[PDB]
Design a protein around this ligand. Structure first.
Ligand code: NA
Ligand code: NA
Lengths: 29, 21, 29, 21
């Protein structure tokens, strides 16, 4: 699911799934 | 930033993990 | 959509919608 | 943290915006 163009909520979703309990930071763009 | 690497170009696990805490 | 219990991807989604171009940070937990 | 304020208790716009950049 990570090896494609990911934009907006699609990108946020990937960060959420990959980073897990680590959490993440997102900034647009 | 992440949009340039993952939205306007193809994302990778390597790049995504750069934005994990 | 913000005034409820929001967990996991539901919470991430709310941050995405509210914060907009500002971006956000999420940490679980 | 945000999970305590928004997941195990009821979230608010006020609290969400604390986690915007
Ligand atoms: Na997974
Ligand atoms: Na809105």
């Amino acid at each position: 699911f990570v090896n494609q163009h990911l934009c907006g909520s699609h990108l946020v979703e990937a960060l959420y799934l990959v980073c897990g309990e680590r959490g993440f930071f997102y900034t647009x763009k | 930033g992440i949009v340039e690497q993952c939205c306007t170009s193809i994302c990778s696990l390597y790049q995504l993990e750069n934005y994990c805490n």
